[PDB]
Amino acid sequence: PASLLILNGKSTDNLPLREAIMLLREEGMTIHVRVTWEKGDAARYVEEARKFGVATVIAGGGDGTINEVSTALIQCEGDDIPALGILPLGTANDFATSVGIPEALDKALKLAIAGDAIAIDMAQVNKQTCFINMATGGFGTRIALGSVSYIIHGLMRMDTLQPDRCEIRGENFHWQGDALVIGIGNGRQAGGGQQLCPNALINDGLLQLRIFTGDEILPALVSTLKSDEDNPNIIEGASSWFDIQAPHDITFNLDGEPLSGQNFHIEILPAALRCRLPPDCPLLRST
């Protein structure tokens, strides 16, 4: 079936992508390519996708583009809403990796056009911003050892990071104390390979919570985020909602977009969006 590929500003000179798209066009497939320039554009092209009667709107880009498209799709009122497909055309591609999208773009394209579509959750913060992958929160200022800088810059989108007090409540969950990193996940992975929520499933109606207590980012935290480390200094929960509050501003990075304040209500939007996913998809619950 026909698709509309929503491409980023950083994709218009990807020759392999062009080659792949072009090779699939000359196989009988209808594939519209639209390029975004500013926010609001994905929305505009999502609705043009509708007018065409298209079956998949394909986010070609980073976790940001996927979130722009996803957010636009869930806002659609009506009957014939396109499934979400995903091309891994970002720098980090955390969500795409974690849901098993193939690196081979012809394959990823084909998945995105002809895969099975399944309803997945999204999440919303403060009845406003939505996210499909991960919300990471910490206390710091907005943006020697590279392991550590990578976390503060890439994962947290900050220049500084310090622990501070907060309280967090959710179903079966109540905690107060100093936290260095808060991970609230629909997906499992953020900031280029950091495993914030190893146990996340994207269609269980449930957000994973992990609170990393600390002092600073130590080999502890770098270790525990890369591969798997089983660690007592990590507090875990699972809830359809989490409330977070703090005497000083916490900064949440929601699929790459910052938000600050003393109070956050984060809540699952159950089965909000159909996404084209491989059958083995590690983040879908067993059936």
Which amino acids are annotated catalytic? 257
DSSP assigned state of 190: B
Strand 181-185 vs strand 207-212: parallel, antiparallel, or unpaired?
antiparallel
91 is known to lie in a ligand binding site: yes
d(CA 194, CA 153): 13
Which of 251, 245, 250, 249 is closest to 263 using CA atoms?
245
**Using CB under 5 A, which of 204, 239, 264, 275 touches Mg ion?**
204
66 is known to lie in a ligand binding site: yes
Judged by CB under 5 A, does residue 206 bind Mg ion?
yes
256 is known to lie in a ligand binding site: no
CB of 268 to Mg ion, least distance (A): 7
CB of 213 to Mg ion, least distance (A): 23
CB 97 within 8 A of CB 71: no
7 is known to lie in a ligand binding site: no
Q: Which structure tokens are listed for 140?
A: 């710091």
Give the nearer residue to Mg ion in terms of CB position, either 21 or 190. 190
Q: By CB under 5 A, which span of 7-15, 66-74, 127-135, 197-205 interacts with Mg ion?
A: 197-205
Three-class secondary structure of residue 154 per DSSP:
helix
d(CA 66, CA 60): 8
Q: Which residue has the tokens 């399944």?
A: 118
Q: By CB under 5 A, which span of 125-133, 144-152, 189-197, 204-212 interacts with Mg ion?
A: 204-212
Judged by CB under 5 A, does residue 201 bind Mg ion?
yes
Q: Which residue is nearest to Mg ion (CB)?
A: 206
CB of 171 to Mg ion, least distance (A): 12
204 is known to lie in a ligand binding site: yes
Q: By CB under 5 A, which span of 9-17, 60-68, 196-204, 257-265 interacts with Mg ion?
A: 196-204
64 is known to lie in a ligand binding site: yes
Give the nearer residue to Mg ion in terms of CB position, either 204 or 255. 204
d(CA 50, CA 15): 28
Give the nearer residue to Mg ion in terms of CB position, either 63 or 204. 204
Q: Which long-range contacts (CB under 8 A, 24 or more apart) does 53-56 make?
A: 53/2, 53/80, 54/1, 54/2, 54/3, 54/4, 54/82, 55/1, 55/2, 55/3, 55/82, 55/83, 55/113, 56/1, 56/3, 56/4, 56/82, 56/83, 56/84, 56/85, 56/112, 56/113, 56/117, 56/276
Q: By CB under 5 A, which span of 78-86, 149-157, 189-197, 206-214 interacts with Mg ion?
A: 206-214
The CA-atom distances, in angstroms, between 225 and each of 28, 87, 188, 192, 262 are 44, 25, 11, 11, 26
Give the nearer residue to Mg ion in terms of CB position, either 115 or 187. 187
Count of residues binding Mg ion (CB under 5 A)? Answer: 3
**Site for Mg ion, rule CB under 5 A:** 201, 204, 206
**Residue ranges at the known binding site for Mg(2+):** 201, 204, 206
**Residue ranges at the known binding site:** 36, 62-68, 91, 201, 204, 206
